[PDB]
Amino acid sequence: SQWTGKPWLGKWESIDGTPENWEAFVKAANIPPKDQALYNGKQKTLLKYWKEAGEDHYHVQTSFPGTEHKMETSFKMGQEGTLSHDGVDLKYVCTEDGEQLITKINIPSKNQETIVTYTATGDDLEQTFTSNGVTGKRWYKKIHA
Ligand SMILES: [Zn+2]
Ligand SMILES: [Zn+2]
C-alpha cells in the first residue's frame, strides 16, 4: 500500500509579524478588532496537531500565550464538528489532499465560509486561509513544546 506523510502533525509557533495580505483579509473577511488583536503585535499562536496510535480521531490544540483564547478539540476526517466562541457557532470539516490538511469552515450567523489549508515540509508550515474571496498566508516554525 501507499506510504503516507502527514507533515502538519506536530507543534507549531507562528513566526514574527502578521500574515501575508493580512490588511486585505481583515477588511474583506470582516475580522472584528477583538479578533485582530490576537494576530497583531508580539502575540504568538501555538498550534498542535496529534494522533494517538489506537484512536480513530485527531487532536488539535491552539493557544495564544498570555491570553485566555484557547481551543482544544478532536476531529475525524470528513465528519462535521461545531465550535463556539463568544456565542458565535462555527461548523467545520477536515479533509486531506495528499500531505495537505484542509479545513472548511462555515459561520451560518455571518453567512461566511473560510477554507484553511496546512502545507508543511520539515520544520516549516504554511497556513493559507481564504474567505470572501481574499487569501491570507501565515507561517509557523516547528517546536518541541
Ligand atoms: Zn483522543
Ligand atoms: Zn476568546
Numbering used by the authors: 27 to 171
How does the study describe this entry?
Though anhydrobiotic tardigrades (micro‐animals also known as water bears) possess many genes of secretory abundant heat soluble (SAHS) proteins unique to Tardigrada, their functions are unknown. Secretory abundant heat soluble (SAHS) protein is one of them and is constantly expressed at high levels in Ramazzottius varieornatus. A previous crystallographic study revealed that a SAHS protein (RvSAHS1) from one of the toughest tardigrades, Ramazzottius varieornatus, has a β‐barrel architecture similar to fatty acid binding proteins (FABPs) and two putative ligand binding sites (LBS1 and LBS2) where fatty acids can bind. However, some SAHS proteins such as RvSAHS4 have different sets of amino acid residues at LBS1 and LBS2, implying that they prefer other ligands and have different functions.
The RvSAHS4 structure was refined at 1.5 Å resolution. The overall structure of RvSAHS4 shared a typical FABP fold having an antiparallel β‐barrel composed of 10 β‐strands, and a helix‐turn‐helix lid between βA and βB. Helix αII in the RvSAHS4 structure had only a single turn and shorter than those in FABPs as is observed in RvSAHS1 structures. However, MolB in the RvSAHS4 structure had a 310 helix (η1) following αII and MolA also had a helix‐like structure in the same region [Fig. 1(C)]. While LBS1 in RvSAHS1 possesses an endogenous FA molecule originating from Escherichia coli in the crystal structure, no electron density corresponding to an FA molecule was observed around LBS1 in RvSAHS4. Residues located at LBS2 in RvSAHS4 were also distinct from those in RvSAHS1. LBS2 in RvSAHS4 was constituted by Cys120, Val142, Tyr144, and Gln153, which respectively correspond to Tyr117, Asp139, Tyr141, and Lys150 in RvSAHS1 [Fig. 2(B)]. Hydrophobic compounds such as FAs, bile acids, and retinoid, which are ligands for FABP family proteins, could not fit well into the electron density. Therefore, we modeled short PEG molecules contained in the crystallization solution (triethylene glycol in MolA and tetraethylene glycol in MolB) [Fig. 2(C), S2, Supporting Information]. The terminal oxygen atom of the PEG molecules could form hydrogen bonds with Thr129, Tyr75, and a nearby water molecule. Our observation that LBS1 in RvSAHS4 is blocked by Tyr65 and that PEG molecules were found at LBS2 suggests that RvSAHS4 mainly uses LBS2 to capture ligands.
